[PDB]
Amino acid sequence: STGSATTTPIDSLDDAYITPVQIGTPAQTLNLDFDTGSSDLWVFSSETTASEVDGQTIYTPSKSTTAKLLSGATWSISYGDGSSSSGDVYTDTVSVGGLTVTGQAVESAKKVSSSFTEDSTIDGLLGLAFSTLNTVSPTQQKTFFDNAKASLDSPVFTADLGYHAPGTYNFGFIDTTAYTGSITYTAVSTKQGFWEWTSTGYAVGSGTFKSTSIDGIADTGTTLLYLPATVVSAYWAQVSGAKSSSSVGGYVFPCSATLPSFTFGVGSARIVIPGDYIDFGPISTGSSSCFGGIQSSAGIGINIFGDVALKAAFVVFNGATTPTLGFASK
Template identity: 50%
Template sequence: MDFDTGSSDFWVFSTLLPSSESAGHTLYNASASKHSSLESGETWSINYGDGSGASGVIYSDRVVLAGVTATSQAVEAATSVSSAFTSDTQNDGLVGLAFDGLNTASPSKVPTFFQTVQKSLFEPVFASALRHNAAGTYDFGWIDPSKYTGKITYTPVSNSSGYWEITANGYAVGSGATVSESLTSIVDTGTTLIYMPDDLLNAYYSQVNGSSDSSDAGGWIFPCDATLPDISFEIGSKEFTVPGSYINYSPYTDDTCYGGMQSSDGFPFNVLGDVFIKSQYIVWAPTVPQMGFAAPSRWTKILLAADGVVVVDDEEGYGSLM
């Protein structure tokens, strides 16, 4: 399941799909659950920013996720999914963690997973500890002190649009001075990259030798061996830094790479996607609503080589001794 703070539907691949759309996926079978019941007349249909989508009918069922139980959760069973979802056999559905205003159920909206379980949690929060090039974690109902350092800085969230919308007060490139600029942005685990205004991108990529805004690539590219500066966003009274190495998102050609920060021109908002989220420990508190940000803990991985030599791999990330 894809945990998505940019949508509000809990939907799954189901046995109601044609085999051409469900091959390779684990399927939800409502008839095999003694807790399921069809929500008569309720349907759903969602379209995502990348053009993918899904639709279907709705059941009420018991859902257990990471030890957290929703005794009567609205489960949106897909009867149709787009080709992008069909081909992604690592993903059997989405857990929408945005606010309920984005829920697509009709004629009546249905509660999100978090709405269903929040009263049973020790604290009405969830936290993300995602990592760069490694598996991360989500915690429901508590804040894990082993996964961050220092204090958590909280900032208000506007949920009027249904998204986790915050305002950064400015940015700094590398060790440069902070540029004051109001950057209203959504924080979205369902978006991979950071999308920001062109003035910020020009300021950033002007410090990357050989970079260019390529129409063929559809965004900023640069030599793969280029040194990338950090980018920091001022949120509340603190600056939160994305290491420059995170901005090297993926190869584009043999010797050029595609940037992990691109233009938000044409978007209804700026987006702090996974490239940013992986650089922070984040507390999501929907009942306030607010978000908290803290520097992630470091973790140390001790590897025992075949010749008996101990190798210590110290990386930015989360967790304890591995």
């Protein structure tokens, strides 16, 4: 089997992407944030504290003839940005772009943190990291991909995120029309539960490529590109007036600037992030200070190839017995 679904930016900055997901019988369609940096499929629901729901579409398990309470199971998750959610668990039928999994753990939120409430466009998350990170207790649950894998034509999914435009998540096949040139595959460590890999270096603008190993994660659920402070300083030094602002929380730059591109290595291949992808606009409405899309990972404890990087590529998440990641230009 295969599946194919369009993923759409939630706003004009590509802060996140939402993908429609069918849950239950009859189908209830919720718009979920596909997150290769976590492993829980959780939703706003009829069980979510009412004051914490503000515009989201909710899953109502009592209206699904295929929903079953997973007795005794609870979940609780905290994300790198300080947001969180928790609740109980149902199993139900879940379909993405025509690909159906029966008995998928659907984690129903009883509580969500303010950042989730405040984002009316995101009805929940669909985790696509390794199932070892799943938070359900006392019986850990599998991701949608893990459950689908054996049925897929090939044990892969691909992320093709758009810049200020829709893109695509495919399951079970590689669309050879969706990228240019060849796909370069690189090794993955699953030791921390992430799609963790090592970039071979970087360049800033038309500058020379610096060969240096950068361990990090391919994370569709993180907006920005978080890299070592040395790398990030080298980038922003090429933008007149750019500076790190402790008050704002990262590098800012004059909105009048033209940003250089940023290249990252994948083996001997190179992915070029155009400068415009690195612009996250005014820090506050009407400001002439703009927020940068490349930020330091210092104090995160891990480098993160988030949407800024991934949307410059066609990305293969290969869930074969030995997982790998592939990147192509597009």
